[PDB]
Amino acid sequence: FLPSAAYLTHQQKVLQLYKRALRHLESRCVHRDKYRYFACLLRARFDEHKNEKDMVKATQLLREAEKEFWHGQHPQPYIFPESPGGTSYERYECYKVPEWCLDDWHPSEKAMYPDYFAKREQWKKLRRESWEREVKQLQEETPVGGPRTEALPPARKQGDLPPLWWHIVTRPRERP
Amino acid sequence: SFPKYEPSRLASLPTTLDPAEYDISSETRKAQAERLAIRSRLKREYQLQYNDPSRRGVVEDPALIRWTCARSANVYPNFRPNTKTSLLGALFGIGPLIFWYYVFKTDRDRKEKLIQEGKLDRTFNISY
Amino acid sequence: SKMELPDYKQWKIEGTPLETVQEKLAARGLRDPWGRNEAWRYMGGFANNVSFVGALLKGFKWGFAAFVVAVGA
Amino acid sequence: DAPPLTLEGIKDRVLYVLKLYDKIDPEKLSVNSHFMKDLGLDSLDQVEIIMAMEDEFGFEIPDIDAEKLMCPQEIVDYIADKKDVYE
Amino acid sequence: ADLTEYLSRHYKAPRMVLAAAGGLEHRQLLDLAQKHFSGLSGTYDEDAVPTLTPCRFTGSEIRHREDGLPLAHVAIAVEGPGWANPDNV
């Protein structure tokens, strides 16, 4: 379930397992030195049969690895206080105001902050000035009869902005 | 080393120990390709009708509309009175009602007969 | 905005649990750790942060002096 | 709780923890390097590096990205995305 | 197309064995296998790896009554122990 391709692969699947087991081993293991010991031990256990030219025995060892992992996880895996699941999970979302607002203000406060609204207005003219031709031509131009991907090409043509960028650029600053 | 994680209606089966994810036939590759294609086209339509600088109103999803019209107005059509429908209807609609009815008859006949004897604690029971 | 970068090749790890666990993993025959990271956790104003009953027995430094003075009171 | 991060500063901190790592050299340690071409180290210790950045700065990066950093400049760019680095 | 899929998904290099028995040295066999089997396979069609499933032994009877036959065949069977256990032997 991922934007790039239809699956992870074998490689990244093993990799995510290694990240999870190392993270759980943090969450199991305090004092950081025995942590470092057991981390090198775990790396050696993956080093034992890294170089199988076989594939089916490798993926079977992957499944038996997942069994001994899920038997040995932690009750509180150590989630960082910025991640979803974690302590924050858009903690300061109280002030994550989208910027389609701030133009519906009374012109007294548009007189209170003048230069900002002048440059914001030329931003919106930058948006609309290159909205129709380049962006919609680049979208209906390149792909197959079905799109069949979730990436999108840049604006390498000559000049102006890559397509469909407004709600990517204009976001909250994640600590206001 | 582990009793292989019996599932439930509550405990979700996680991503790892499926074990159907490791029997990748070509049909699962075909299905994942087409499913990514469907998600690609829907995000394309949505993003183009999401980033229009002239678009004042809301994007007006037919998915939410279709779910709501299925949920409320498309119940009564369609229907047929089956044995399962009629059985569960008269069970979960009439059962608790008639049960609570008999137990309030029983409590009320107790209290009426008991204060008809006069030996109740209504020595001062004014706030009736 | 300045930080002046307290720099590398200074840690030089030697901090006794990390050095001895590289000893034990050396006898194990792996000898490939992450390395000289945590010496800022194992020296400086660190490095024998006091044992637990020391924080409890920390009291009578100024304490017994005041207690003997009040005994004399 | 906000000391300001800056681009020179984040460059220095990331290169400090790469230089502290063992099996590379302080000679051929470039900003525009590769974890695949010229340092030649494997994917495994590459994700050990990703673990070092997550454990220093205090936040996960997802595995949609840990496939595809593979150079220190894009590491600095990606914490510049997560932190939105201007004062 | 299904034939080509089966050929593609199961005629793969690591699972299979070339073995010789007779009056011939291993170097000759290794060199000839090097000169011919260098270049069959080693990678799957987007990692569609066939993998074993340890199935379940049911226990039942199917009886095919067909009386116009001279003799009757019975097969009775129970669980198989497996391979690596010595209960095999």
Q: Which CATH number characterizes residue D72's domain?
A: 1.10.1200.10
Neighbours of chain A (3+ CB pairs under 8 A): B, C, D, E
In whole angstroms, give the CA distance from residue D2 to residue A153.
36
3-class state of residue C59 by DSSP: coil
Tokens of E18: 């070339």
- Give the largest CA-CA distance in chain D: 39
Q: At residue A153, what is the residue type?
A: P
Cβ of A56 within 8 Å of Cβ of E49? The answer is yes
In whole angstroms, give the CA distance from residue B81 to residue B73.
18
Cβ of A46 within 8 Å of Cβ of D44? The answer is yes
| Residue A40 near residue C32 (C-beta atoms within 8 A) | yes
Cβ of E48 within 8 Å of Cβ of B29? The answer is yes
Q: What is the 3-state secondary structure (H, E, C) of chain B?
A: CCCCCCCCCCCCCCCCCCCHHHCCCHHHHHHHHHHHHHHHHHHHHHHHCCCCCCCCCCCCCHHHHHHHHHHCCCCCCCCCCCHHHHHHHHHHHHHHHHHHHHHHHHHHHHHHHHHHHCCCCHHHCCCC
- Backbone Cα Rg of chain D: 13
3-class state of residue D21 by DSSP: strand
Q: Give the closest of C30, C38, C41 to A40, CB-based.
A: C30
Tell me which method was used to determine the 3D structure: cryo-EM
Is the peptide bond prior to B82 cis by the omega test (within 30 degrees of 0)? no
Q: DSSP letters along C3-55, please?
A: -----SSS-----HHHHHHHHHHHHHT-----BTTTHHHHSSS-SSPPPHHHH
Q: Is residue D4 part of a domain?
A: no
Nearest CA-CA partner of A77 in A16, A21, A31, A37: A21
Domain span at residue D61 reads: 9-83
Tokens of E84: 């690596």
Tell how far CA A138 is from the center of its chain. Answer: 25
* Gap from C52 CA to chain D (nearest CA, Å): 28
Cβ of E46 within 8 Å of Cβ of B29? The answer is yes
Residue D3 per-residue DSSP state: P
Q: Is residue D21 part of a domain?
A: yes
Q: Which residues between 84 and 123 in chain B have a beta carbon less than 8 angstroms from any beta carbon of chain A?
A: none
Contacts of D50 in chain A (CB under 8 A): 19
| Residue A63 near residue B1 (C-beta atoms within 8 A) | no
Q: Is residue D31 part of a domain?
A: yes
Angle between the A10-28 and A56-70 helix axes, to the nearest 10 degrees? 20
Resolution in angstrom units: 4.2
Q: Is residue D35 part of a domain?
A: yes
Q: What is the 3-state secondary structure (H, E, C) of chain A?
A: CCCCCCCCCHHHHHHHHHHHHHHHHHHHCCCCHHHHHHHHHHHHHHHCCCCCCCCHHHHHHHHHHHHHHHCCCCCCCCCCCCCCCCCCCCCCHHHCCCCCCCCCCCHHHHHHCHHHHHHHHHHHHHHHHCHHHHHHHHHCCCCCCCCCCCCCCCCCCCCCCCCCCHHHHCCCCCCC
Q: Provide the residue ranges of all domains of chain A, joining segments of one domain with +.
A: 8-77, 97-173
Task: Give the residue carrying structure tokens 């040295």.
Answer: E25
Q: Give the count of domains, chain D.
A: 1
Contacts of C21 in chain A (CB under 8 A): 33-34, 36-37
Q: Which residues between 3 and 62 in chain C have a beta carbon less than 8 angstroms from any beta carbon of chain A?
A: 17-18, 21, 24-25, 28, 30, 32-34, 38, 41
